[PDB]
């Protein structure tokens, strides 16, 4: 599987498992600034 919002605060994208629950976009940013 069922759908889930990105775990990033106030992000309304859908998360995925390959990105640990983040959307792809936040996961990219996270790889940069996290």
């Amino acid at each position: 599987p069922p759908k889930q919002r990105c775990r990033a605060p106030a992000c309304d994208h859908f998360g995925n498992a390959k990105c640990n629950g983040y959307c792809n976009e936040c996961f990219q940013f996270k790889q940069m600034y996290g």
């Binding site: 990033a8 605060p9 106030a10 992000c11 983040y22 976009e25 936040c26 990219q28 940013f29 996270k30 600034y33 996290g34």
Partner: protein
């Protein structure tokens, strides 16, 4: 006056600010602390997206209020 900005990693950023500080100012402060270009920053308070040319006070952001920071790429 301090406010808090919560990032995608759950990290809390503490900013020294004034009620008359603009959103653009707050994003410039975030760029200083974190290195994130302001055009990639989206600030959210009370679930509402904040406009660059407006003050914290315009959004009733108070001492030790907490904002949420969402990051988005820009393609033009």
């Amino acid at each position: 006056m301090q406010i808090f900005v919560k990032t995608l990693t759950g990290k809390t950023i503490t900013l020294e600010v004034e009620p008359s500080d603009t959103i653009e100012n707050v994003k410039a402060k975030i760029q200083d602390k974190e290195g994130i270009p302001p055009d990639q920053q989206r600030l959210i308070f009370a679930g509402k997206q904040l406009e660059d040319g407006r003050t914290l006070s315009d959004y009733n952001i108070q001492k030790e209020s907490t904002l949420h920071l969402v990051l988005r790429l820009r393609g033009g």
